[PDB]
Amino acid sequence: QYDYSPFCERNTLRESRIDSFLKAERAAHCLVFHKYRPDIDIMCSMLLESVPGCNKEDLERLSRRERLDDIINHETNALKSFWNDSGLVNSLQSHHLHEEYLLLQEELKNVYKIKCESLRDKCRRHYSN
Amino acid sequence: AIERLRLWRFDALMQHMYRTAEYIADKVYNISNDPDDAFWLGQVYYNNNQYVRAVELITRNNLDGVNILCRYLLGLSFVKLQRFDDALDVIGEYNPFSEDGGIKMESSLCFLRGKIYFAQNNFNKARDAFREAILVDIKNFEAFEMLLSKNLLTPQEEWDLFDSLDFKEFGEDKEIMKNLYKINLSKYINTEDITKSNEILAKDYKLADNVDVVRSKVDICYTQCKFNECLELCETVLENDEFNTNILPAYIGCLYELSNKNKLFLLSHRLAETFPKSAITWFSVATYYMSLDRISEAQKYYSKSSILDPSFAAAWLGFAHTYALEGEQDQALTAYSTASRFFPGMHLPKLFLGMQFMAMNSLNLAESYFVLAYDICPNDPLVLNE
Amino acid sequence: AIERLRLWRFDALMQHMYRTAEYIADKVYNISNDPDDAFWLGQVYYNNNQYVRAVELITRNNLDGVNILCRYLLGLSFVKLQRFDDALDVIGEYNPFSDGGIKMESSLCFLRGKIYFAQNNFNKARDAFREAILVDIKNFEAFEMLLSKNLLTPQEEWDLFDSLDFKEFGEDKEIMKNLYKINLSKYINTEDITKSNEILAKDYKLADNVDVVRSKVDICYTQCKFNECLELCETVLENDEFNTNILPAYIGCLYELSNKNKLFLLSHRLAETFPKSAITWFSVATYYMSLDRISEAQKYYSKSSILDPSFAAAWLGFAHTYALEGEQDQALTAYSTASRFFPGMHLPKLFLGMQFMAMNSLNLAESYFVLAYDICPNDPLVLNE
Amino acid sequence: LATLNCLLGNLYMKLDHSKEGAFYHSEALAINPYLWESYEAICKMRATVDLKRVFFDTLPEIMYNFALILRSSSQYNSFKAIRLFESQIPSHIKDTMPWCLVQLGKLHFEIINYDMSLKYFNRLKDLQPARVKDMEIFSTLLWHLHDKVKSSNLANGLMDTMPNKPETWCCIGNLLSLQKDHDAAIKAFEKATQLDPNFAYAYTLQGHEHSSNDSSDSAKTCYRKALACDPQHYNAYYGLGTSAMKLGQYEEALLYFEKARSINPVNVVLICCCGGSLEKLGYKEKALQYYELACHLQPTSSLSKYKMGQLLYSMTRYNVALQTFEELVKLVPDDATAHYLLGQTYRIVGRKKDAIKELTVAMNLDPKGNQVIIDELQKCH
Amino acid sequence: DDQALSTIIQLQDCIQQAIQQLNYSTAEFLAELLYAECSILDKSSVYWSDAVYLYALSLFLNKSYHTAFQISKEFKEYHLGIAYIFGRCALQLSQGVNEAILTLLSIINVFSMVLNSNLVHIPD
Amino acid sequence: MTSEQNSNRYWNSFHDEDDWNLFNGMELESNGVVTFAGQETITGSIFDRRITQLAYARNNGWHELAL
């Protein structure tokens, strides 16, 4: 019988939640495992396996301590790293990539400014706070 | 030894000696880790309105499930505490046991499950739960009477279920208990049978003028609009019990239709001075306002009666009548629709929606609701006339 | 034939299907037509929280003169129906009589003592409770109620405990004598209570019993072992957080420890748990006292006092609110009221004498402090005062 | 030659890029496996290593189990971590260990299961009354539960113990936002962030309060500061997506929603928001894919089933739409607009008997719009 | 049981190793896990006192002075290092100095339970 | 208009304090959704049992912010 003890320390769980968790859990694993029961199984050189936005080539250069078609390759490549290998890009219409691209760096550049005083005046900030 | 303490605790509980019963239950449970003693202490906690303490008692040691009786007590404690989620949790969505001289333990669990489904407004599952509860043990009657009172089954279905169940458990008392059950069955179907049953019960046995038999006679007369027999039976039973809640709705309606304004006034005053909390008294006051043509005022009093007690057809129905009688017709539809949805299994709300839709001169929907009401109840002059 | 129906009625009572209970009680009563069946149906009505039905049913044929338990059920129904004079008239002011279970005469005497306690003739209540406990010792209420409200000074409580006999218990008197001895007052003969505590702890595995822990807590509270109060009452409260007997002592030793978070938590949980008990409002008032908000503690002690006329902590905390507020003339009347309602309680008199110091009136303070010291030879407050 | 790589990783993570810092944390772990701080720094991002080679090439197994737990929690797959807790990590470690209590409470909290998390790190709070680290999650849980007394407990206790810790002021602000006020919540959050910067949670709550205060620019700036403090934080991304939703510019809203979903794959709010951005963009076929993922990801959610029904009715997959709506009503009967779609699907399929009762429920739910319900009744027959 | 003692010794060695360098959060986690693991062992075991002392020292080292102060107050008498941690917490917080005095006076007078150990930061 | 108000009050005299407190500003709407006035609002659909105890809770129960 399906085990539900760890999902709630209360030894009894009403049957609605039993299938609610069971059907929830299986597809959650099915998403991770496929791009069955939980209790039967949980399983399944540079050490670093993955970094968000890092491809296999970028991992290799780390181990070494380091026109329309071409820009479309850069168009998709830019969104590959930022969207963490999202599969919806290939379904996007080509002219819909352009406006999302321009908003990417424009939003990105704003981060650079954010990420980057006379004696009498700058003493007040500590007094008032 | 311990048996003397146990029987002393049982008597103290029976004698409404709460402190001694609690003390001795605690002592006996400390002496022996017997779950029946824990059930007894939980019962003592239950009686004096100390529900959470009994909940924590039966929860702390996880002794529920070891024996079914404490599980039932715990579930009842939740259902009174209205934590219906936890009650359904401990009891279970369906029968877990599905393949002494007292009621079968499993049957009580199915009754509680039906009650919680009814509370959660899950009428469809509650019907099945109550049907299974009555089918498992005929010794049970709470589920049978609840289903009949709340009109959760059609009269034909009620008769079919009554015929399906047997009386083999009773044995010697088979015929008397069959008649006793048959008293409470719904009307509009083969009323002569309920008749001959109540006479055969009346003379043969000492139960000649008991409460339920006169109640059934009053119900028969009220259905048949035999209103003078209605009254005479009603006062002849009221003179013994001045506050018998089983008959009060029929009595109140029967006075309303005779328009005995004054007797209605005396009843309203007597019930107000005694039972302010119960919705019956406020229903009586509101129908007193009705008898004086005060629809706008007792609008509020039906609101009060309905809120003081949910699952009361009379209060909400009268509230909808107050909506429908004078103007403000648009929202009478919403009120009667609420009646239909929250009170499934009764033809009258559907019939009322149909006649109201006919009242807007909107026909086809009136036909729809009329045929719905006819489906719910086959034998009713009102629906067929409409 | 009737026996099956009687057992079915009993089962309906046990499993709390009240509508079937009353239905079957009515049926079996009409069949048999005996007063015991009417008693059963009246008991069903009582459990139904429908006292009017039960009392009318018992009185319609004047069954009170037939059996001895039906009249008691009618009397208790009147008791909870807020009717007292007719209740005593039915039961009778004086004793008309002067196997398992308990004797009925003791229960009737106990009910009479309850009515007298309701009617504020405290001496008659003491007489009734003493009579009930001496006639029957199984009636633990006649003991616990008498000892709870401090209706009598502890010396005569010990004397009556010694006077009453446990002989009719027999083989079980060996344990029940000690169990009853546990519940007496703690100021005097303290050591014997302790030895009884180890007696229960050994050979009876009752160390885990809640009331043994309650007795130990009250021992610790008497000599002001407030830290031990906290530790033991925390150990017992984890299992059960709403033992009404346990809670006031926990409030006392928490306020002594002067901590607001845990008092705060328990008070807010009890407020949503038991809205109509004076205990939670008393706890709220104590929390406000610990936060030195006297103005709110005023009202939140007044409500607790109104809810329970037998709640000495309420009156003394009330007069504490008065005294700490700044005005004392009303605190004088408050402490006098607390002293007069509860004869034999030294603390109201002691606090009243502290107030006499506060007014620089030492002449009454001498007598009041002597009276308080008469029964409290060793405690810091008395000697400090 | 193990702490130096850790220091390099910390500097890299702090300054510009977490990629090289993760590389150096991996190198440090290669030098020594018992550098749990490097593992925590790695798990701060969505980076993972091959634990079998790290920890092997019973204490190593125990450490490997905790590493798997932490990796799953960072990766946001809590069911597996709960299962390892059930199987491995014996109880006399699980219950006592405050850090496993924190993590396990987090794991139960990310699932809609709310009461068990409360119980778990409430026993934690009991064990360590003065613990201050990672109490903002308790504050968020109390905000979700709409409970005020326990939040008041937390606020008073933390203020008494640590008047200056940022978590205390964060909890004060969350309680304020709970009760009625938003400006005072903003003031508390700003005090919390001035006393200790680099706290992206305070900025996230600032942006949320600003959004609730109908101040778009301030919320955007607060979220930008949050991202500046923490590169990976789905809460501020979701807030930004919702803000661009309310301005109607669906492009950057989709951008933010997808970016938030990237680091937290299992969350139906973000899946639903990304899908809705998709329909506003017009991609019916791909939007369904996420919603198909969403309801299978977990049942008993009104939002996911509702949007399934809306999308299926839009492009007319009535056969599955009817059953999705049916189970929606089964899991909740109080949705007003849902029963309208129920009735529309019933009349389209051609089961008038169910259509009448469903529309009756519809008028019962919505007094104001009965007339249009009446019109559908007329269209029903 | 054969490997149970080895795990405790290894955890202790890792804790001293971590505290030897300026690595404190890892010291925190290892001290926490060792303290949790030692719960099953009886209080009479020297391992429990050693783990409690290491946990107290760590919780002091990361400025979480309150928590160190309680975790030291519970078992202040058992070990000398726990008393040292308690005294340091008391001096920083000005809370409960008196019992710190009552413990330190006794521990110094007796010296001139567990008193001597090979762990790090054991007071002289 | 005064007669009905007097009659309303005369019958309105028969309540418990908490019971009367529940119905001070009581209003029931046609569809069945309920509005409760706290002397906050407890708007909820009637015929579910838990709601009226919730109105009971905040009426007599002790609620407080504590900073």
PDB file of N, CA, C and O in Angstrom, chain A residues 2 7 9 20 23-24 27 38-39 45-47 49-50 52 61 82-83 86 88 92-93 96 100 107 115, chain D residues 19 23 26 46-50 53 83 113 116 120 224 228 251 255-256 258-259 283 290 295-297 299-300:
ATOM      1  N   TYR A   2       0.442   2.258  -0.765  1.00  0.00           N
ATOM      2  CA  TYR A   2       1.233   3.473  -0.916  1.00  0.00           C
ATOM      3  C   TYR A   2       1.506   4.122   0.435  1.00  0.00           C
ATOM      4  O   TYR A   2       0.594   4.324   1.241  1.00  0.00           O
ATOM      5  N   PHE A   7       4.779  12.448   4.322  1.00  0.00           N
ATOM      6  CA  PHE A   7       4.117  13.640   3.812  1.00  0.00           C
ATOM      7  C   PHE A   7       3.279  14.330   4.873  1.00  0.00           C
ATOM      8  O   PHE A   7       2.910  15.494   4.693  1.00  0.00           O
ATOM      9  N   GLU A   9       2.981  13.987   9.376  1.00  0.00           N
ATOM     10  CA  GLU A   9       3.248  13.222  10.589  1.00  0.00           C
ATOM     11  C   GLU A   9       1.976  12.637  11.184  1.00  0.00           C
ATOM     12  O   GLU A   9       2.038  11.652  11.929  1.00  0.00           O
ATOM     13  N   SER A  20      -4.460  13.044  -4.235  1.00  0.00           N
ATOM     14  CA  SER A  20      -3.982  14.381  -4.557  1.00  0.00           C
ATOM     15  C   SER A  20      -2.465  14.434  -4.515  1.00  0.00           C
ATOM     16  O   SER A  20      -1.831  14.995  -5.414  1.00  0.00           O
ATOM     17  N   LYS A  23      -1.025  11.576  -7.329  1.00  0.00           N
ATOM     18  CA  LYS A  23      -1.033  12.026  -8.715  1.00  0.00           C
ATOM     19  C   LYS A  23      -0.121  13.233  -8.899  1.00  0.00           C
ATOM     20  O   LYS A  23       0.485  13.405  -9.963  1.00  0.00           O
ATOM     21  N   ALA A  24      -0.013  14.079  -7.872  1.00  0.00           N
ATOM     22  CA  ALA A  24       0.922  15.196  -7.937  1.00  0.00           C
ATOM     23  C   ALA A  24       2.362  14.709  -8.002  1.00  0.00           C
ATOM     24  O   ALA A  24       3.139  15.157  -8.854  1.00  0.00           O
ATOM     25  N   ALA A  27       3.740  12.842 -11.526  1.00  0.00           N
ATOM     26  CA  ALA A  27       4.014  13.687 -12.684  1.00  0.00           C
ATOM     27  C   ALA A  27       5.134  14.677 -12.393  1.00  0.00           C
ATOM     28  O   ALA A  27       5.868  15.079 -13.304  1.00  0.00           O
ATOM     29  N   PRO A  38       6.890   6.388  -6.115  1.00  0.00           N
ATOM     30  CA  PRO A  38       8.051   7.047  -5.503  1.00  0.00           C
ATOM     31  C   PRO A  38       8.775   6.138  -4.525  1.00  0.00           C
ATOM     32  O   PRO A  38      10.008   6.112  -4.485  1.00  0.00           O
ATOM     33  N   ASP A  39       8.017   5.365  -3.748  1.00  0.00           N
ATOM     34  CA  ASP A  39       8.618   4.558  -2.695  1.00  0.00           C
ATOM     35  C   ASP A  39       9.455   3.405  -3.233  1.00  0.00           C
ATOM     36  O   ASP A  39      10.362   2.940  -2.535  1.00  0.00           O
ATOM     37  N   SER A  45      39.116  14.674 -13.912  1.00  0.00           N
ATOM     38  CA  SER A  45      37.883  15.187 -14.495  1.00  0.00           C
ATOM     39  C   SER A  45      37.289  16.289 -13.624  1.00  0.00           C
ATOM     40  O   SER A  45      37.266  16.176 -12.398  1.00  0.00           O
ATOM     41  N   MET A  46      36.828  17.363 -14.261  1.00  0.00           N
ATOM     42  CA  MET A  46      36.248  18.485 -13.533  1.00  0.00           C
ATOM     43  C   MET A  46      34.993  18.067 -12.775  1.00  0.00           C
ATOM     44  O   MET A  46      34.085  17.449 -13.338  1.00  0.00           O
ATOM     45  N   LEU A  47      34.943  18.424 -11.490  1.00  0.00           N
ATOM     46  CA  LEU A  47      33.815  18.028 -10.653  1.00  0.00           C
ATOM     47  C   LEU A  47      32.534  18.757 -11.031  1.00  0.00           C
ATOM     48  O   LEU A  47      31.449  18.164 -10.995  1.00  0.00           O
ATOM     49  N   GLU A  49      29.428  19.875 -12.534  1.00  0.00           N
ATOM     50  CA  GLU A  49      28.577  19.300 -13.565  1.00  0.00           C
ATOM     51  C   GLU A  49      27.855  20.358 -14.386  1.00  0.00           C
ATOM     52  O   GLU A  49      27.808  20.256 -15.616  1.00  0.00           O
ATOM     53  N   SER A  50      27.286  21.371 -13.737  1.00  0.00           N
ATOM     54  CA  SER A  50      26.456  22.325 -14.454  1.00  0.00           C
ATOM     55  C   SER A  50      26.496  23.674 -13.758  1.00  0.00           C
ATOM     56  O   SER A  50      26.640  23.756 -12.536  1.00  0.00           O
ATOM     57  N   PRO A  52      24.039  27.350 -14.340  1.00  0.00           N
ATOM     58  CA  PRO A  52      22.986  27.965 -15.156  1.00  0.00           C
ATOM     59  C   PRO A  52      23.577  28.881 -16.216  1.00  0.00           C
ATOM     60  O   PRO A  52      24.407  29.745 -15.925  1.00  0.00           O
ATOM     61  N   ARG A  61      36.216  25.277 -21.324  1.00  0.00           N
ATOM     62  CA  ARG A  61      37.134  26.409 -21.241  1.00  0.00           C
ATOM     63  C   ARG A  61      37.447  26.753 -19.790  1.00  0.00           C
ATOM     64  O   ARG A  61      38.515  27.300 -19.490  1.00  0.00           O
ATOM     65  N   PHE A  82      20.015  32.550 -20.882  1.00  0.00           N
ATOM     66  CA  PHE A  82      19.239  33.298 -19.902  1.00  0.00           C
ATOM     67  C   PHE A  82      17.988  32.540 -19.471  1.00  0.00           C
ATOM     68  O   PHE A  82      17.552  32.671 -18.322  1.00  0.00           O
ATOM     69  N   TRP A  83      17.406  31.736 -20.360  1.00  0.00           N
ATOM     70  CA  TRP A  83      16.190  30.996 -20.050  1.00  0.00           C
ATOM     71  C   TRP A  83      16.461  29.564 -19.604  1.00  0.00           C
ATOM     72  O   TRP A  83      15.513  28.782 -19.467  1.00  0.00           O
ATOM     73  N   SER A  86      15.241  26.603 -22.218  1.00  0.00           N
ATOM     74  CA  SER A  86      13.792  26.556 -22.337  1.00  0.00           C
ATOM     75  C   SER A  86      13.401  26.090 -23.733  1.00  0.00           C
ATOM     76  O   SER A  86      13.925  26.582 -24.736  1.00  0.00           O
ATOM     77  N   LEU A  88      10.545  26.452 -25.296  1.00  0.00           N
ATOM     78  CA  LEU A  88       9.533  27.228 -26.000  1.00  0.00           C
ATOM     79  C   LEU A  88      10.128  28.184 -27.024  1.00  0.00           C
ATOM     80  O   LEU A  88       9.380  28.734 -27.838  1.00  0.00           O
ATOM     81  N   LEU A  92       8.657  29.851 -30.724  1.00  0.00           N
ATOM     82  CA  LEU A  92       8.424  31.278 -30.893  1.00  0.00           C
ATOM     83  C   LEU A  92       8.593  31.669 -32.354  1.00  0.00           C
ATOM     84  O   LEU A  92       9.467  31.149 -33.054  1.00  0.00           O
ATOM     85  N   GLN A  93       7.750  32.589 -32.813  1.00  0.00           N
ATOM     86  CA  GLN A  93       7.901  33.123 -34.157  1.00  0.00           C
ATOM     87  C   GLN A  93       9.139  34.011 -34.229  1.00  0.00           C
ATOM     88  O   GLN A  93       9.496  34.694 -33.266  1.00  0.00           O
ATOM     89  N   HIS A  96       9.147  37.535 -33.274  1.00  0.00           N
ATOM     90  CA  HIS A  96       8.883  37.710 -31.851  1.00  0.00           C
ATOM     91  C   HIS A  96      10.140  37.588 -30.998  1.00  0.00           C
ATOM     92  O   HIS A  96      10.116  37.981 -29.827  1.00  0.00           O
ATOM     93  N   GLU A 100      11.956  40.731 -27.760  1.00  0.00           N
ATOM     94  CA  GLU A 100      12.414  40.156 -26.500  1.00  0.00           C
ATOM     95  C   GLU A 100      13.922  40.309 -26.349  1.00  0.00           C
ATOM     96  O   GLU A 100      14.430  40.464 -25.232  1.00  0.00           O
ATOM     97  N   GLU A 107      17.098  45.792 -20.288  1.00  0.00           N
ATOM     98  CA  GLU A 107      16.929  45.419 -18.890  1.00  0.00           C
ATOM     99  C   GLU A 107      18.260  45.028 -18.259  1.00  0.00           C
ATOM    100  O   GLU A 107      18.536  45.387 -17.108  1.00  0.00           O
ATOM    101  N   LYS A 115      24.205  47.839 -10.067  1.00  0.00           N
ATOM    102  CA  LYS A 115      25.277  47.072  -9.445  1.00  0.00           C
ATOM    103  C   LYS A 115      26.551  47.888  -9.276  1.00  0.00           C
ATOM    104  O   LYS A 115      27.416  47.506  -8.482  1.00  0.00           O
TER     105      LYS A 115
ATOM    106  N   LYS D  19      29.704  31.859 -12.183  1.00  0.00           N
ATOM    107  CA  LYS D  19      30.187  30.692 -12.914  1.00  0.00           C
ATOM    108  C   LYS D  19      31.605  30.317 -12.492  1.00  0.00           C
ATOM    109  O   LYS D  19      31.879  29.162 -12.137  1.00  0.00           O
ATOM    110  N   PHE D  23      33.037  27.166 -10.297  1.00  0.00           N
ATOM    111  CA  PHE D  23      34.184  26.363 -10.709  1.00  0.00           C
ATOM    112  C   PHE D  23      35.188  26.225  -9.571  1.00  0.00           C
ATOM    113  O   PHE D  23      35.701  25.129  -9.303  1.00  0.00           O
ATOM    114  N   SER D  26      33.956  24.018  -6.807  1.00  0.00           N
ATOM    115  CA  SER D  26      34.132  22.632  -7.219  1.00  0.00           C
ATOM    116  C   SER D  26      35.575  22.187  -7.031  1.00  0.00           C
ATOM    117  O   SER D  26      35.833  21.070  -6.568  1.00  0.00           O
ATOM    118  N   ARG D  46      21.865  27.403  -9.135  1.00  0.00           N
ATOM    119  CA  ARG D  46      21.383  26.120  -9.646  1.00  0.00           C
ATOM    120  C   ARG D  46      22.516  25.308 -10.268  1.00  0.00           C
ATOM    121  O   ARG D  46      22.466  24.907 -11.429  1.00  0.00           O
ATOM    122  N   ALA D  47      23.558  25.063  -9.478  1.00  0.00           N
ATOM    123  CA  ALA D  47      24.720  24.304  -9.907  1.00  0.00           C
ATOM    124  C   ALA D  47      24.824  23.020  -9.096  1.00  0.00           C
ATOM    125  O   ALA D  47      24.465  22.983  -7.916  1.00  0.00           O
ATOM    126  N   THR D  48      25.320  21.964  -9.738  1.00  0.00           N
ATOM    127  CA  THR D  48      25.433  20.660  -9.101  1.00  0.00           C
ATOM    128  C   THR D  48      26.740  19.998  -9.510  1.00  0.00           C
ATOM    129  O   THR D  48      27.380  20.387 -10.489  1.00  0.00           O
ATOM    130  N   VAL D  49      27.136  18.988  -8.733  1.00  0.00           N
ATOM    131  CA  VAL D  49      28.336  18.208  -8.994  1.00  0.00           C
ATOM    132  C   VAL D  49      27.979  16.727  -8.938  1.00  0.00           C
ATOM    133  O   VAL D  49      26.852  16.346  -8.621  1.00  0.00           O
ATOM    134  N   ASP D  50      28.964  15.890  -9.265  1.00  0.00           N
ATOM    135  CA  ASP D  50      28.800  14.435  -9.263  1.00  0.00           C
ATOM    136  C   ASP D  50      29.205  13.910  -7.893  1.00  0.00           C
ATOM    137  O   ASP D  50      30.368  13.593  -7.642  1.00  0.00           O
ATOM    138  N   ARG D  53      31.429  10.622  -7.245  1.00  0.00           N
ATOM    139  CA  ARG D  53      32.875  10.744  -7.378  1.00  0.00           C
ATOM    140  C   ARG D  53      33.461  11.643  -6.297  1.00  0.00           C
ATOM    141  O   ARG D  53      34.565  11.380  -5.805  1.00  0.00           O
ATOM    142  N   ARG D  83      11.508  11.861   0.565  1.00  0.00           N
ATOM    143  CA  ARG D  83      11.626  10.407   0.540  1.00  0.00           C
ATOM    144  C   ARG D  83      12.952   9.934   1.132  1.00  0.00           C
ATOM    145  O   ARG D  83      12.983   8.945   1.872  1.00  0.00           O
ATOM    146  N   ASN D 113       1.185  22.211   1.029  1.00  0.00           N
ATOM    147  CA  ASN D 113       1.068  21.720   2.396  1.00  0.00           C
ATOM    148  C   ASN D 113       1.632  22.751   3.362  1.00  0.00           C
ATOM    149  O   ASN D 113       2.841  22.997   3.377  1.00  0.00           O
ATOM    150  N   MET D 116       1.944  21.167   8.088  1.00  0.00           N
ATOM    151  CA  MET D 116       3.087  20.349   8.485  1.00  0.00           C
ATOM    152  C   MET D 116       4.371  21.153   8.613  1.00  0.00           C
ATOM    153  O   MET D 116       5.147  20.911   9.541  1.00  0.00           O
ATOM    154  N   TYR D 120       6.618  21.496  11.947  1.00  0.00           N
ATOM    155  CA  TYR D 120       8.011  21.065  11.909  1.00  0.00           C
ATOM    156  C   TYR D 120       8.944  22.154  12.423  1.00  0.00           C
ATOM    157  O   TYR D 120       9.640  21.980  13.435  1.00  0.00           O
ATOM    158  N   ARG D 224      14.740  45.464  -8.983  1.00  0.00           N
ATOM    159  CA  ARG D 224      16.049  45.578  -9.616  1.00  0.00           C
ATOM    160  C   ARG D 224      17.160  45.500  -8.582  1.00  0.00           C
ATOM    161  O   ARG D 224      18.179  44.836  -8.801  1.00  0.00           O
ATOM    162  N   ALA D 228      20.091  42.767  -8.207  1.00  0.00           N
ATOM    163  CA  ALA D 228      21.478  43.176  -8.027  1.00  0.00           C
ATOM    164  C   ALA D 228      22.103  42.454  -6.843  1.00  0.00           C
ATOM    165  O   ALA D 228      23.255  42.011  -6.911  1.00  0.00           O
ATOM    166  N   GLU D 251       5.633  41.455 -22.993  1.00  0.00           N
ATOM    167  CA  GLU D 251       6.902  40.891 -23.441  1.00  0.00           C
ATOM    168  C   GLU D 251       7.866  40.700 -22.276  1.00  0.00           C
ATOM    169  O   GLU D 251       8.288  39.576 -21.975  1.00  0.00           O
ATOM    170  N   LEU D 255       9.185  37.519 -20.099  1.00  0.00           N
ATOM    171  CA  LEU D 255      10.605  37.363 -19.814  1.00  0.00           C
ATOM    172  C   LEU D 255      10.826  37.063 -18.335  1.00  0.00           C
ATOM    173  O   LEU D 255      11.463  36.064 -17.971  1.00  0.00           O
ATOM    174  N   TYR D 256      10.261  37.907 -17.470  1.00  0.00           N
ATOM    175  CA  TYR D 256      10.436  37.763 -16.030  1.00  0.00           C
ATOM    176  C   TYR D 256       9.809  36.472 -15.526  1.00  0.00           C
ATOM    177  O   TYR D 256      10.385  35.782 -14.678  1.00  0.00           O
ATOM    178  N   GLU D 258       9.213  33.612 -17.169  1.00  0.00           N
ATOM    179  CA  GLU D 258      10.012  32.461 -17.562  1.00  0.00           C
ATOM    180  C   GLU D 258      11.292  32.390 -16.746  1.00  0.00           C
ATOM    181  O   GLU D 258      11.711  31.303 -16.333  1.00  0.00           O
ATOM    182  N   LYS D 259      11.942  33.535 -16.524  1.00  0.00           N
ATOM    183  CA  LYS D 259      13.182  33.524 -15.757  1.00  0.00           C
ATOM    184  C   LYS D 259      12.938  33.043 -14.333  1.00  0.00           C
ATOM    185  O   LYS D 259      13.742  32.283 -13.779  1.00  0.00           O
ATOM    186  N   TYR D 283       0.342  32.276 -28.365  1.00  0.00           N
ATOM    187  CA  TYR D 283       0.844  30.925 -28.631  1.00  0.00           C
ATOM    188  C   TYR D 283      -0.034  29.911 -27.904  1.00  0.00           C
ATOM    189  O   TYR D 283       0.260  29.458 -26.795  1.00  0.00           O
ATOM    190  N   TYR D 290       2.503  23.989 -20.940  1.00  0.00           N
ATOM    191  CA  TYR D 290       2.788  24.314 -19.546  1.00  0.00           C
ATOM    192  C   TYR D 290       1.590  24.023 -18.645  1.00  0.00           C
ATOM    193  O   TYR D 290       1.756  23.508 -17.534  1.00  0.00           O
ATOM    194  N   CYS D 295      -1.359  20.976 -14.170  1.00  0.00           N
ATOM    195  CA  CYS D 295      -2.367  20.198 -13.457  1.00  0.00           C
ATOM    196  C   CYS D 295      -1.865  18.795 -13.149  1.00  0.00           C
ATOM    197  O   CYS D 295      -2.136  18.250 -12.072  1.00  0.00           O
ATOM    198  N   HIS D 296      -1.138  18.187 -14.089  1.00  0.00           N
ATOM    199  CA  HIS D 296      -0.479  16.927 -13.775  1.00  0.00           C
ATOM    200  C   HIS D 296       0.547  17.107 -12.668  1.00  0.00           C
ATOM    201  O   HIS D 296       0.705  16.214 -11.828  1.00  0.00           O
ATOM    202  N   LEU D 297       1.220  18.261 -12.624  1.00  0.00           N
ATOM    203  CA  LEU D 297       2.176  18.517 -11.551  1.00  0.00           C
ATOM    204  C   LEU D 297       1.520  18.390 -10.184  1.00  0.00           C
ATOM    205  O   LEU D 297       2.132  17.877  -9.240  1.00  0.00           O
ATOM    206  N   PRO D 299      -2.819  18.056  -8.577  1.00  0.00           N
ATOM    207  CA  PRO D 299      -4.263  18.316  -8.625  1.00  0.00           C
ATOM    208  C   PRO D 299      -4.689  19.316  -7.565  1.00  0.00           C
ATOM    209  O   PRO D 299      -3.849  19.875  -6.854  1.00  0.00           O
ATOM    210  N   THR D 300      -5.999  19.537  -7.454  1.00  0.00           N
ATOM    211  CA  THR D 300      -6.592  20.316  -6.364  1.00  0.00           C
ATOM    212  C   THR D 300      -6.087  21.758  -6.348  1.00  0.00           C
ATOM    213  O   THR D 300      -5.821  22.329  -5.289  1.00  0.00           O
TER     214      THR D 300
END
